[PDB]
Structures are given as structure tokens and as C-alpha cells.
Amino acid sequence: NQIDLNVTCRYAGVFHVEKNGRYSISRTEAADLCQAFNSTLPTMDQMKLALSKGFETCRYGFIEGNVVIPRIHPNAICAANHTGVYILVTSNTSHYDTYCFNASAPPEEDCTSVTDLPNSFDGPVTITIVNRDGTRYSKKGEYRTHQEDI
Ligand SMILES: Cc1nc[nH]c1CN1CCc2cccc(N)c2C1
């Protein structure tokens, strides 16, 4: 009973989280996951500031209101060569990654490791935070408040 949460650097408090390295997070799960990180779904303005500080991914993720990919460098296989906060317009499907916003993070680029999920609650799951440099932090608990997500 095990979940990997792969996390990125924070940029102006904004970071990307993916579950088990594959698109698998619902919109309700995304809100609960950010909450477990004492974070919220970013606004578009928070995301645009993060982009200006150096944030880009090649993954669709929830923010408040939309599914987006922040892009700095044009790449034909990421957001169809767009730059800026690319907004996903047309999709059949409902499960992506998520972005989260932590107001207490440093103002610019923070590529230190994440080593806690401070607001997860009691539960049976072995949750492992996986950083891009391979650093891991594990705890037993739960973050999903919606039965449909479990
Ligand atoms: C290349 C790729 N395919 C699906 N997701 C991804 C990006 N992942 C790749 C796996 C991974 C592991 C630990 C931290 C981070 N940020 C990531 C980012």
C-alpha cells in the first residue's frame, strides 16, 4: 500500500507533483494533495510569477481553474512548442498531475529537497516523497479525503 509523490523545485512557491510518475491525479485529489503539503492550487497569477522565475515542466497539471504546462523554452513535444503558461483546451480525460503553491517557500528558485508532507493525516499508506535528485522521505498516512480517489 504505497504511493510515490515525485516533486520539483519550487519557483516563487509553485511546484509540480506527480503520483507514481504517471498522470493519475483527479481534480479533487489535487486539492487534497496540495493541502497535505500545506499548499493550495496555484492561481494563474501565481503560476505566471513562477514561470518568470524559471519554472517549466513538460507535464499537464491542475492549477485553480485550469490544466496547464508552464513553458520557457519552445519544445515540439511539450505543449506543442508554445512558451508561457500553456492552457490545455481540449481533452477527453480527467486525470493529470498537479501544481501546488506554498506561500512560505522562498521567493525565487528553490531546488532544495522536500522532506515532509506536513499536513497528511493518519492512515495506512506508505507515502514516499521522491525528489529529482533521488532523495526520499517516507511516512505512513493518507491525504485523500474523497473515497472515489482511493
Ligand atoms: C519525464 C516524466 N515522465 C513522467 N513524468 C515525468 C517527470 N518526472 C520524472 C520522474 C521524477 C522523479 C522524481 C522527481 C521528479 N520531479 C520527476 C519528474
Side-chain angles (χ1 to χ4, degrees):
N1 199 166
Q2 212 286 312
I3 294 171
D4 282 346
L5 300 172
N6 303 335
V7 300
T8 67
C9 300
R10 277 67 64 215
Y11 288 86
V14 179
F15 58 112
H16 168 257
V17 188
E18 66 186 13
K19 177 172 71 176
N20 300 319
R22 64 181 185 248
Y23 291 125
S24 57
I25 303 168
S26 69
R27 177 63 176 68
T28 52
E29 186 175 7
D32 286 347
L33 185 45
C34 297
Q35 193 166 99
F37 283 112
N38 279 332
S39 296
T40 51
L41 277 289
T43 65
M44 179 62 75
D45 192 71
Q46 287 161 350
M47 180 57 83
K48 282 171 175 175
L49 192 63
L51 172 77
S52 75
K53 304 301 191 185
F55 189 40
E56 70 174 347
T57 74
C58 192
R59 301 286 292 177
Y60 289 120
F62 296 104
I63 65 168
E64 185 69 44
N66 283 98
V67 174
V68 302
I69 304 186
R71 295 300 304 167
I72 296 176
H73 305 97
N75 179 331
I77 64 161
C78 303
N81 218 47
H82 288 96
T83 67
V85 185
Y86 175 76
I87 302 174
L88 169 67
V89 178
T90 305
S91 178
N92 283 344
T93 58
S94 63
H95 280 50
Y96 301 97
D97 301 338
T98 197
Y99 300 95
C100 295
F101 166 64
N102 171 26
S104 304
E108 298 190 302
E109 182 186 63
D110 177 16
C111 285
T112 58
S113 288
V114 177
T115 39
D116 194 15
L117 185 65
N119 200 37
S120 61
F121 50 84
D122 184 80
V125 185
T126 297
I127 303 158
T128 301
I129 309 312
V130 187
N131 291 279
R132 183 64 281 193
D133 69 3
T135 308
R136 288 180 184 235
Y137 166 84
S138 287
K139 72 188 295 184
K140 195 186 65 77
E142 181 57 86
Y143 63 91
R144 299 162 298 175
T145 73
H146 298 270
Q147 192 59 44
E148 326 82 58
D149 295 323
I150 299 173

